[PDB]
């Protein structure tokens, strides 16, 4: 799977909000482009003069994520974050010249991402009460990954002493994205666990935080809630469900070729962090079938 790389695999079956620190600093921002940020401004102007209803929006930038020594007390993860925008994304990661910006970042800063917006995405492995994960079909008419399978999520917009509010907005945003797209009541959702961070190499290395969320509704109830919004209540064109039993071997299925990179990230991290048992009981052959 060359189009997805794991930046972080969380310990302990995934980290709760209270174990994560953020450092939001202008030291974590994109570097100005070698010939100047006028190249970004020019692409944006061209785009607005075709689609003048488009708007800019602020985004969090991922710089890096450092895990504590395993088994330690205290904060277990430090997220280093800066600020970027939708405009900066369109002029760097989405640019035809994105590979040239990665090579120049390696040369100038020893960092393939130094000249990339790299907005932080969020996504969920969302499990039902009857042990299915939730999948969404993307419209064939959008610009990014048309017609591909996704999981719930999005790209959160901003608003450890500003740090804790930023971690709160990241955990909040994955629940809000589930309520907005799947049409589930907030009180049917567990507090999220962070499983890890995956990078999309087809989008020049931009990263998504992948979470596990449990729903108290069955697959049939989740489907009713999604459909009862009507076609205007969701950006996706359909919903479907795969038994957690079968998610284990999803990379061997014909579905795998249809998953967008960030959804592949969520499923690899679900299988390594919530699946893959370590103890004698769940590891026994009748509960963990060989091959
Ligand atoms: C639905 C919320 N719109 C949104 O988040 N955008 C990203 C920021 N600006 C935009 O103009 C749109 C572009 C887009 O793809 O929306 C159709």
Residue ranges in 62-162 assigned as alpha helix (H): 86-91, 98-109
Q: CB of 269 within 8 A of CB of 210?
A: yes
Rounded distance between C-alpha atoms, residue 276 and residue 233, angstroms: 36
Q: CB of 30 within 8 A of CB of 115?
A: yes
Exposure of 284 by Cβ count < 10 A (0-12 exposed, 13-18 middle, 19+ buried)? exposed
CA–centroid distance for 5 within its chain = 12
- Ligand 1 touching residue 55 (CB < 6 A): yes
Tokens of 266: 């969520």
Tokens of 55: 């708007």
Write the Ramachandran bin of 194: left for phi over 0, alpha for psi from -120 to 50, otherwise beta.
beta
Please tell me the total number of residues recorded for the chain in this structure: 291
Q: Which atom of ligand 1 is nearest to the CA of 54?
A: 11
CA–centroid distance for 157 within its chain = 14
- Ligand 1 touching residue 54 (CB < 6 A): yes
Q: Which atom of ligand 1 is nearest to the CA of 235?
A: 1
Which residue in the block uniquely carries the two structure tokens 């930023």? 166
Determine the 3-state secondary structure of 61 from DSSP: strand
Which residue in the block uniquely carries the two structure tokens 């969020």? 122
How far, in Å, are 53, 64, 83 from residue 208 at the CA level?
27, 12, 15
Determine the 3-state secondary structure of 21 from DSSP: strand
Residue nearest to atom 11 of ligand 1 (CA): 54
In this structure, what are the phi and psi dihedrals at residue 3, rounded to the nearest 5 degrees? -90, -5
Rounded distance between C-alpha atoms, residue 199 and residue 94, angstroms: 14
List, in sequence order, every beta strand (DSSP E) within the chain: 4-9, 20-24, 58-67, 77-85, 121-127, 132-137, 149-150, 153-154, 193-200, 206-214, 238-243
How far, in Å, are 87, 108, 192 from residue 76 at the CA level?
33, 32, 16
Residue nearest to atom 16 of ligand 1 (CA): 54
Residue 70 DSSP label: T
Rounded to the nearest angstrom, the distance between the alpha carbon of 38 and the centre of ligand 1 is 22
How far, in Å, are 7, 41, 126 from residue 121 at the CA level?
13, 23, 16
Resolution (A): 1.6
Determine the 3-state secondary structure of 216 from DSSP: coil
Q: Is the dihedral of CA 147, 148, 149, 150 positive or negative?
A: negative
The answer on whether 55 is annotated among ligand-binding residues is: yes
Exposure of 291 by Cβ count < 10 A (0-12 exposed, 13-18 middle, 19+ buried)? exposed
Rounded distance between C-alpha atoms, residue 117 and residue 86, angstroms: 9
Longest dimension (CA), the chain: 62
Rounded distance between C-alpha atoms, residue 79 and residue 167, angstroms: 9
Write the Ramachandran bin of 256: left for phi over 0, alpha for psi from -120 to 50, otherwise beta.
alpha
The answer on whether 138 is annotated among ligand-binding residues is: yes
**Those residues with Cβ within 8 angstroms of residue 59's Cβ, 6 or more apart along the chain or in another chain:** 83, 84, 85, 86, 89, 117, 119, 120, 155, 156, 157, 158
Tokens of 257: 């070729």
The arrangement of strands across the sheet holding 20-24 comes to 20-24, 77-85, 58-67
Determine the 3-state secondary structure of 241 from DSSP: strand
Exposure of 69 by Cβ count < 10 A (0-12 exposed, 13-18 middle, 19+ buried)? exposed
Write the Ramachandran bin of 227: left for phi over 0, alpha for psi from -120 to 50, otherwise beta.
alpha
Least Cα distance to 148 among 202, 184, 224 occurs for 202
Rounded to the nearest angstrom, the distance between the alpha carbon of 143 and the centre of ligand 1 is 11
The residues with which 61 forms a beta bridge, in sequence order, are 82, 119
Rounded distance between C-alpha atoms, residue 108 and residue 218, angstroms: 52
HSE on the CB side for 221, CA within 13 Å? 12
Rounded distance between C-alpha atoms, residue 178 and residue 46, angstroms: 33
Rounded distance between C-alpha atoms, residue 127 and residue 214, angstroms: 5
């Amino acid at each position: 799977d060359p189009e997805v790389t794991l930046l972080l695999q969380c310990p302990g079956g995934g980290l709760p909000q209270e174990q994560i620190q953020a450092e939001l600093s202008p030291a974590h921002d994109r570097r100005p482009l070698p010939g100047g940020d006028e190249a970004i401004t020019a692409i944006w102007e061209t785009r607005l003069k075709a689609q003048p209803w488009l708007f800019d929006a602020p985004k969090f930038r991922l710089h890096s994520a450092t895990l504590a020594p395993i088994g330690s007390r205290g904060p277990q993860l430090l997220l280093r974050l800066g600020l970027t925008s939708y405009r900066d994304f369109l002029g760097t990661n989405w640019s035809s010249s994105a590979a040239w910006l990665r090579q120049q970042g390696a040369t100038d800063w020893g960092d393939t991402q130094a000249y990339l917006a790299d907005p932080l995405g969020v996504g969920a492995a969302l499990a039902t009460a009857d042990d299915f994960l939730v999948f969404l079909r993307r419209s064939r008419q959008v610009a990014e990954a048309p017609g591909l399978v996704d999981v719930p999520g999005g790209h959160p917009e901003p608003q450890d002493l500003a740090g804790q509010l930023v971690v709160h907005e990241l955990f909040s945003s994955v629940l809000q994205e589930i309520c907005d797209e799947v049409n589930l009541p907030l009180l049917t959702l567990s507090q999220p666990l962070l499983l890890g961070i995956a990078r999309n190499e087809t989008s020049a290395g931009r990263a998504s935080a992948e979470f596990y969320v449990q729903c108290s509704l069955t697959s049939e109830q989740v489907r009713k809630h999604y459909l009862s919004g009507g076609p205007e209540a969701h950006e996706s064109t359909g919903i479907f469900f795969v038994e957690t039993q079968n998610v284990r071997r999803l990379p061997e299925t014909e579905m795998w070729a249809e998953l967008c990179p960030s959804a592949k990230g969520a499923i690899i991290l679900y299988n390594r962090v919530q699946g893959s048992p370590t103890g004698a009981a769940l590891g026994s052959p009748a509960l963990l079938p060989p091959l």
